[PDB]
Symmetry: none
Subunit: 360 residues, 2 copies
């Protein structure tokens, strides 16, 4: 029973940590454009199909190796995906593309109980990303874990709004207000990182890569043991929920001040403690090709009282400390450029604990 995790905070025992090796800039297609900050469009336009800066990747490798050493020191068993060249171009009957990377296990794998679930993904450059984790998953399967792969999409043109106003306009907010994004409801699609666990209740957000059909698939597949709730936030470019609403303990959540939850009162009524972290201090000149500065709150809980947090983000370190939570500081400044913090770079496989309800 190697696999067993019901939430984001029980005592961590086993985890999968991604790899920065051979990461490739994804081709600049509509869904990629819908996520890139204008600032990087020229980079994507010129670099697509090529590896991310090798000098930069090398620093990310060292940072993640250190993070793994600390995890082992903290008593956690660490697994790593297989090294793969992400530059290989593949062709399905629906499209052609080069790959991205396997840096973010959280984007593709979610563990609910004793079941490991492979998300379908929504990006053409991430269609074959599961290939890096199969050696690990088959081992868990042989050892008794349940293994599920959500329906892999065709990712044909119909899945995308080829005429999305990506070009800056921000009324994406209105569309967002309507639940209207770059991905249509043509077929189910989702990144696992758009789901966050709190025992019997899982919270999901409809985002640029996770559609209602995808959420309904998760809901139908997990019922009746788990309830999947849809929540929304003031956010014109969502992709993943863990740098917006990160649950760090039973009834305790970190809520991004810039992305307030429309259903916050549901949690206040449940007697939950909503904490708004201080702002990130990461330099504006440091390249964050895939996300926002909010990776600072993308922490990983080793247990209720131990949090792995970024070495450079002192203000948020202080916050945890005043709360009596021990801070394990690790520097992943360069790994951040690939699009993730601690929660994104990992996938908790086994946390010591039981299935409970925290919403009463």
């Amino acid at each position: 029973c190697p696999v067993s995790s019901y939430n984001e905070w029980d005592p961590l025992e086993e985890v999968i940590v991604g790899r920065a090796e051979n990461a490739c800039v994804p081709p600049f297609t509509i869904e990629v454009k819908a996520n890139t900050y204008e600032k990087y469009w020229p980079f994507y336009q010129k670099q697509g199909g090529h590896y991310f800066p090798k000098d930069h990747l090398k620093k990310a490798v060292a940072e993640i190796e250190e993070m793994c050493n600390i995890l082992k020191t903290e008593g956690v068993t660490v697994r790593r995906p297989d090294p793969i060249d992400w530059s290989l171009k593949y062709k399905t009957p629906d499209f052609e593309s080069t790959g991205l990377y396997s840096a973010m296990p959280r984007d593709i794998l979610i563990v609910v109980g004793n079941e490991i679930i492979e998300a379908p993904m929504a990006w053409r450059s991430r269609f074959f990303e599961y290939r890096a984790y199969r050696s690990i998953i088959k081992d868990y399967f042989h050892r008794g874990a349940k293994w599920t792969t959500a329906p892999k999409p065709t990712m044909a043109d119909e899945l995308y709004n080829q005429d999305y106003p990506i070009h800056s306009v921000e009324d994406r907010h209105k569309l967002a207000a309507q639940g209207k994004f770059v991905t249509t409801e043509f077929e189910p699609c989702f990144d696992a990182a758009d789901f966050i666990r709190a025992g019997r209740d899982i919270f999901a957000q409809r985002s640029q890569v996770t559609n209602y059909l995808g959420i309904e698939w998760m809901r139908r597949h997990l019922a009746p043991d788990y309830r999947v709730h849809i929540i929304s936030f003031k956010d014109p470019n969502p992709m993943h929920i863990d740098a917006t609403f990160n649950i760090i303990g039973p009834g305790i959540v970190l809520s991004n001040p810039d992305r307030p939850c429309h259903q916050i009162d549901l949690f206040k009524k449940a007697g939950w403690t909503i904490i708004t972290p201080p702002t990130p201090i990461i330099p504006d000149d440091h390249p964050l090709w895939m996300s926002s500065k909010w990776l600072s709150m993308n922490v990983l809980m080793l247990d209720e009282k131990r949090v792995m947090v970024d070495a450079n983000e002192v203000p948020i370190q202080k916050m945890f400390e005043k709360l009596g939570i021990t801070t394990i500081k690790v520097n992943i400044r360069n790994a951040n450029s690939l699009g993730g913090g601690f929660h994104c770079w990992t996938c908790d496989v086994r946390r010591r604990g039981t299935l409970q309800s925290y919403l009463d």
Copy 2:
């Protein structure tokens, strides 16, 4: 400027490939015993001074001829040592002995920049092994290359620990732990294969045939342009570093799972990718008179994306392929018996590239 090579992976242009002709079983002296697996001691005891099985040598000749054809096909210029009868007994004022062979250019020649260096060797049966390569070296010299011969040892009794517990005991590990082997620090000695190149940094291991004095000689001779680092591994019978820690690209290394490096964190901190190859599939009944089954990882890089690998070792072929490295499969099963794989059987003379640092 025929000679010019700074690492193990730049685009290969010229190479020297050894010969299996007239190879002789070396006399069974202490340094030979310290390298032979118990299984072969009777062979060495009865065959010493005689040619290796002629029927076996003939298959090795054919395999290496084919390997040379493929090298030419791959655009590489191939040079071969002069044919010599290795059975001739010679006598220095310090000892008497018959020779071995000139099958392994990597054991005696190392190219650093535009300089070709002849290692001193540490085996009495390899004292005059340089004679097979002089026609080639003089030609390069006439053409402008630098030529260096490290101090040839007397190889008197004082160079050897005549009371080394070779007879199986494995605490050779403790001695090994102390940097204590069959060769003393009486005078400098080394095989060039105990050094592996990565531009401005060269890594060396103190082994059964390479002593600290020998390493210090290389360090002093190459400074200040090159830095020679000493690294060690969990290995009770080292002789050569290329079937233990084979560097295959800038910041990429193949590390033998059975012989972990004590200084691995130095490389993880440099952001290097450490790959552990799958186990060899070579039959236990096939005679490997001079080494271990690990010849499988003793690959030769034609360039960063092309590797010459053994035809029979499918698992490691697959590994390179998932990494996007094209595999050039050649069968050298019988040549393996002489003690080497592709890296050992060759000496890269010219690789298209410049002197760089890869350790930052």
